[PDB]
Amino acid sequence: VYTQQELKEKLYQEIISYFDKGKMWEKAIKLSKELAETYESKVFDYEGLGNLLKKRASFYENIIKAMRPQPEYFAVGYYGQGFPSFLRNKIFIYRGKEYERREDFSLRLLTQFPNAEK
Amino acid sequence: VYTQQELKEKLYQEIISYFDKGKMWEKAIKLSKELAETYESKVFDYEGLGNLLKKRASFYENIIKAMRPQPEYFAVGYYGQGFPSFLRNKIFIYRGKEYERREDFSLRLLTQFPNAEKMTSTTPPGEDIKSSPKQYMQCFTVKPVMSLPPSYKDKPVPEQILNYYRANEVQQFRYSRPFRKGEKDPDNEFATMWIERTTYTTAYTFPGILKWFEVKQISTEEISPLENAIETMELTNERISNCVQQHAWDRSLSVHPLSMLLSGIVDPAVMGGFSNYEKAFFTEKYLQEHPEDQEKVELLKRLIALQMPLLTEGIRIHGEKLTEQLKPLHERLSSCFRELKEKVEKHYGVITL
Amino acid sequence: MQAIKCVVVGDGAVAKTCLLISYTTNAFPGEYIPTVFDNYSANVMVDGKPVNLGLWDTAGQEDYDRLRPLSYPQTDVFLICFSLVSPASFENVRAKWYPEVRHHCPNTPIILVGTKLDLRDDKDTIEKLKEKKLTPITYPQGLAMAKEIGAVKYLECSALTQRGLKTVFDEAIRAVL
Amino acid sequence: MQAIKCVVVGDGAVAKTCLLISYTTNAFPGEYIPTVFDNYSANVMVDGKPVNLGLWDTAGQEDYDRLRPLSYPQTDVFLICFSLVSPASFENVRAKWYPEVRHHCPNTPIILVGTKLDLRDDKDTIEKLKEKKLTPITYPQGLAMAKEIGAVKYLECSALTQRGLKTVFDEAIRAVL
């Protein structure tokens, strides 16, 4: 059955869980606000508000307390014509990983294709 | 030093603590919101947001989880002239205490003054005492007008929210005046009922700086016996709905309250209100007593009719709690319930969904 | 939460109905609202903690003897009720209301109430009863029936001035307590 | 958090400055931005966990010998640096840069780097050095100095093609590790 309400309820609970474990807490807060608002103004699941506000407190504490790395951003120019229709001659500015070394990344993008030159 | 920011910070922390321990959590939430907003938008004390939101979660959990008593509201008329300039001839509608007994409260207000007597004509003032010395008093318990809170008239809010509003943020007050108007016919005590209710406004919203508070505006009301039947049926149906749901939201609950209410419904043994409303209204003699004032009866009919399925759901929860001990009680309950279903359908001429 | 179970039984010429309908409504003397439905319960405590209380309103009609006996089982206290300024009431007490109810439940604390306590000293009603060869049963006879039944307290309340009514139900609640 | 301390010392005619300013800036070959301030530190790890790393940029000027000795105390590893296609650099290595720095801190793991690794096989620069009676010191002589100094690894990197530069600092970091 799942009327729309309890569906988004499950969706937002999972989205919050993902953002939580994924170290992006600004968004996890930004959505826990929408949850709590709809709970306490439409369904009054005050146990929900309880544990939800608990989680949001944890979110704010994590944003300040710890510290998390900065991804390195590369900029890949898939140049030429022997490339597919969607990679041909335009730059894919790959987000990277926490402390990726341009050699490591260009290495993985060697692995991504034949003709590993520079 | 204390620049303004950290001052209100201390103030609001203390205000929240007071409202917390004082069992008024709606306001404690309403203020923890202001705290958190100013923190995270002006000073970024995210440890503050942490513990603050923690506390607000506790607040919401308490509002729903537990249950707290309802204060009883009296209405004291310090009548006479031997009273000071500020208590002289105006009514102080004291907020009370959790289960205060009008004797206990009028006792404390005996202690509050010399000349511990009582008045008797509780409805009107006393003219001989309108300027007399020898200080006069009158004490009586009244009923709190329900606030009509915003944003709550359409949603199906749980009970806790409503019962908790049922005594706080209250400003209008009401009392019951039984006036005798009609024939003193042998058995029928309900053919003379008239109520001229007491309208009381106290311009400060309980609770506040002080428990007591003087009334500001006082008005008279009027209730005809048909309209009295109206409110009696509305209150009856609401009582039944409330007990039904309040037991639908708990499991370790006594079966006694529903036995109470259903027994009350079934057997008006000492005095029977169904047939007495009948004798008063359903006969043509009342249409000779009321040619053009009729549709009150259609209201009464549809309200008892809507009582019928709510009564049925009460019987359903009764069966959920029915046992060999409740076997004879539910036996009679089912008996008179079926009889009443057929009575309303065929006997009355009334219609229900 | 805990509850209280108790009974009120008697004739119909004394009107304990008004007494209880004015104790529950919280109302002022002389301004009671009669209500249609019987079984006046209430949510009021006196001592210790809040509890749930009812008042079984029992008919005075004779035919309704068939329906009554099943309430008494599994109760906490009982309030056997009589009147002091009604001799027919006392006759019914010595005939039916004391013997049979005490017979169904001889095992429970019991309390006794004295109704119309202001007409026990009213000269006009006493006069009209003397002319009708009717007696206001005084306190010693109440004590006699009390020590015959052994109630935890023989009490006397009223409804024109509510004298000790709250005292009566205070004692009744504190009977188990 | 944990840090890394290490030194780079050598002449001025080889330009290790460009090497480190292009390893820290993350930049592409042939597009380095020189910067004013020395002491090129960085926030980059290779293995295990993130750490803090610096690169002491040490002058090649002779007068600045008065200021240098105090950096070496309380360090973790040292990167003694030379060039393969510069004979004057090798002379200074055998005279000053190997002996004295090894003298102040004979107790620490050590690593060696080989600069201008693409002019070690470039025929034109080799020709111009032969005409100038200048020799490209080949790998076996590097091995000789390596087993004379006992470095955990003798490495050879570059800056025109960055060949193994990251390998050099990988080994240097994993020296303690």
Pairing of strands B198-206, B217-220: antiparallel
Q: What are the φ/ψ torsions at residue B78 (nearest 5 degrees)?
A: -75, 85
User: Do C148 and C142 meet the contact criterion of CB atoms below 8 Å apart?
Assistant: no
Residue of B nearest to C163 (CA): B103
Q: Do D166 and A98 count as a contact with CB atoms less than 8 A apart?
A: no
Using a CB–CB cut-off of 8 Å, the residues of A that contact D are: 69, 72, 98-99, 101-103
User: Do D52 and D70 meet the contact criterion of CB atoms below 8 Å apart?
Assistant: no
Touching status, chains C and D (3+ beta-carbon pairs under 8 Å):
no
The approach used to solve this structure was cryo-EM
Least CB-CB distance to B46: which of A46, A53, A64? Answer: A64
- Produce one character per residue of B240-275: b if its CB has 16 or more CB atoms within 10 Å, e if not: bbebbebbeeeeeeebbbbbbbbbbbbbbbbbbbee
Round to whole Å and give the CA distance between D71 and A76.
40
Q: Which two tokens stand for residue D34?
A: 């020189």
Residue of B nearest to C5 (CA): B256
Least CB-CB distance to B270: which of C17, C29, C30? Answer: C17
Round to whole Å and give the CA distance between A73 and B21.
53
- For chain A, how far is it from start to end, CA to CA, in angstroms? 56
Round to whole Å and give the CA distance between B173 and B186.
35
Q: Select from C44, C38, C43, C35 the least CA-distant residue to C9.
A: C38
Round to whole Å and give the CA distance between B39 and B45.
6
Q: For helices B256-266 and B225-248, what crossing angle results, to 10°?
A: 150
Q: Is C157 exposed, middle or buried (0-12, 13-18, 19+ CB in 10 A)?
A: buried
Q: Do A101 and D50 count as a contact with CB atoms less than 8 A apart?
A: no
User: Do C9 and C58 meet the contact criterion of CB atoms below 8 Å apart?
Assistant: yes
Neighbours of C143 (CB within 10 A): 11
CA distances from B316 to B245, B246, B328 (A): 12, 14, 16
Q: Which two tokens stand for residue B337?
A: 């319930």
Q: What is the DSSP string of A45-62?
A: -HHHHHHHHHHHHHHHHH
SS3 D3: strand
User: Do C101 and C36 meet the contact criterion of CB atoms below 8 Å apart?
Assistant: no
Q: Do B271 and C36 count as a contact with CB atoms less than 8 A apart?
A: yes
User: Do C46 and C52 meet the contact criterion of CB atoms below 8 Å apart?
Assistant: no
How far is A52 from chain B, CA to nearest CA, in Å? 8
Q: What is the resolution of this structure in A?
A: 3.8
Q: Select from B143, B138, B109, B104 the least CA-distant residue to B121.
A: B138
Pairing of strands B141-144, B170-174: antiparallel
Q: Select from D6, D10, D4, D3 the least CA-distant residue to D115.
A: D10
Place of tokens 């104790």: C23
Among positive and negative, which fits the CA dihedral A105, A107, A111, A114? positive
Residues 99-128 of C with CB under 8 A from B: none
Query: Strand ranges (DSSP E) for chain C?
Result: 3-4, 7-9, 52-53, 56-57, 78-83, 110-115
SS3 A76: strand
Residues in Cβ contact with C84 at an 8 Å cutoff, skipping those fewer than 6 apart: C114, C115, C116, C117, C120, C136, C137, C138, C142, C156
Count Cα atoms within 13 angstroms, Cβ side, for D129: 17
Which residues of chain B neighbour C58 with C-beta distances below 8 Å?
269-270
Q: Select from C163, C166, C157 the least CA-distant residue to C83.
A: C157
Round to whole Å and give the CA distance between D81 and B283.
118
Residues in Cβ contact with D142 at an 8 Å cutoff, skipping those fewer than 6 apart: D84, D112, D114, D154, D156
How far is B10 from chain A, CA to nearest CA, in Å? 20
Q: Do A53 and B51 count as a contact with CB atoms less than 8 A apart?
A: no
SS3 B174: strand
Q: Do A46 and B54 count as a contact with CB atoms less than 8 A apart?
A: no
Beta bridge partners of D154: D112
Angle (nearest 5°) at CA B289 between B285 and B294: 95
Residue of D nearest to A71 (CA): D44
Q: Which two tokens stand for residue A8?
A: 């988004």
Q: Is D167 exposed, middle or buried (0-12, 13-18, 19+ CB in 10 A)?
A: middle
Residues in Cβ contact with D42 at an 8 Å cutoff, skipping those fewer than 6 apart: D23, D24, D53, D54, D55
User: Do D169 and D46 meet the contact criterion of CB atoms below 8 Å apart?
Assistant: yes
Touching status, chains D and B (3+ beta-carbon pairs under 8 Å):
no
Least CB-CB distance to D166: which of A72, A99, A103? Answer: A103
Least CB-CB distance to C26: which of B141, B177, B268? Answer: B141
Q: Select from B287, B294, B243, B290 the least CA-distant residue to B264.
A: B243
Q: Which two tokens stand for residue D50?
A: 């993130």
Q: Select from D163, D158, D96 the least CA-distant residue to D125.
A: D158
Q: What are the φ/ψ torsions at residue C128 (nearest 5 degrees)?
A: -65, -25
Residue of D nearest to A75 (CA): D28
Q: What are the φ/ψ torsions at residue D9 (nearest 5 degrees)?
A: -130, 140
Q: Do A58 and B49 count as a contact with CB atoms less than 8 A apart?
A: no
Residue of A nearest to D162 (CA): A103
Residue type, B342: E
Q: Select from D177, D173, D175 the least CA-distant residue to D46.
A: D173
- For chain D, how far is it from start to end, CA to CA, in angstroms? 15
Q: Do D26 and A69 count as a contact with CB atoms less than 8 A apart?
A: no
Round to whole Å and give the CA distance between C58 and C12.
10
How far is D45 from chain A, CA to nearest CA, in Å? 7
**Mutation for testing the A interface, residue in B45, B60, B161, B249 having most A CBs under 10 Å:** B60
Which residues of chain A neighbour B54 with C-beta distances below 8 Å?
53-54, 57
**CA A16 to centroid of chain Cα atoms:** 10
Q: Select from B260, B263, B252, B244 the least CA-distant residue to B306.
A: B244
**Mutation for testing the C interface, residue in B270, B277, B307 having most C CBs under 10 Å:** B270
Q: Do B64 and A42 count as a contact with CB atoms less than 8 A apart?
A: no
Neighbours of D160 (CB within 10 A): 13
Round to whole Å and give the CA distance between C119 and C87.
13
Round to whole Å and give the CA distance between A104 and A87.
21
Q: What is the DSSP string of C98-142?
A: THHHHHH--SS-EEEEEE-TTSSS-HHHHHHHHHTT-----HHHH
Residues 7-66 of D with CB under 8 A from A: 26, 44-46, 50
Residue of A nearest to D26 (CA): A102
Touching status, chains A and B (3+ beta-carbon pairs under 8 Å):
yes
Round to whole Å and give the CA distance between C67 and C121.
37
User: Do B49 and A59 meet the contact criterion of CB atoms below 8 Å apart?
Assistant: no
Least CB-CB distance to C45: which of B99, B189, B264? Answer: B99
Which residues of chain A neighbour D45 with C-beta distances below 8 Å?
99
Q: What are the φ/ψ torsions at residue D104 (nearest 5 degrees)?
A: -65, -40
**CA D91 to centroid of chain Cα atoms:** 16
Round to whole Å and give the CA distance between D175 and D111.
8
Q: Select from B90, B87, B95, B122 the least CA-distant residue to B215.
A: B90
Round to whole Å and give the CA distance between D155 and B121.
110
Residues in Cβ contact with C152 at an 8 Å cutoff, skipping those fewer than 6 apart: C109, C110, C111, C171, C175
Round to whole Å and give the CA distance between C20 and B285.
33
Least CB-CB distance to A69: which of D26, D46, D50? Answer: D50
Least CB-CB distance to B57: which of A41, A54, A60? Answer: A54
User: Do B208 and B168 meet the contact criterion of CB atoms below 8 Å apart?
Assistant: no
Which residues of chain B neighbour A48 with C-beta distances below 8 Å?
none
- For chain B, how far is it from start to end, CA to CA, in angstroms? 71
CA distances from C145 to C103, C118, C172, C173 (A): 16, 21, 18, 21
**Mutation for testing the A interface, residue in B25, B46, B52, B62 having most A CBs under 10 Å:** B46
Neighbours of B41 (CB within 10 A): 8
Q: Do D50 and A72 count as a contact with CB atoms less than 8 A apart?
A: no
Round to whole Å and give the CA distance between D157 and A7.
58
Domain span at residue C166?
1-177
Round to whole Å and give the CA distance between D20 and D53.
12
CA distances from C51 to B105, C5, D128, D154 (A): 20, 11, 109, 89
Q: What are the φ/ψ torsions at residue A47 (nearest 5 degrees)?
A: -65, -35
Round to whole Å and give the CA distance between B55 and B50.
9
Q: Do A46 and B61 count as a contact with CB atoms less than 8 A apart?
A: yes
**CA A59 to centroid of chain Cα atoms:** 15
Q: Select from C153, C156, C155, C154 the least CA-distant residue to C175.
A: C153
Q: What is the domain count for chain C?
A: 1
Round to whole Å and give the CA distance between B232 and B226.
10
Neighbours of chain B (3+ CB pairs under 8 A): A, C
Q: Do C41 and B141 count as a contact with CB atoms less than 8 A apart?
A: no
Reply yes or no: is the peptide bond before residue B328 cis, omega within 30 of 0: no
Q: Do D26 and A102 count as a contact with CB atoms less than 8 A apart?
A: yes
User: Do D162 and D29 meet the contact criterion of CB atoms below 8 Å apart?
Assistant: yes
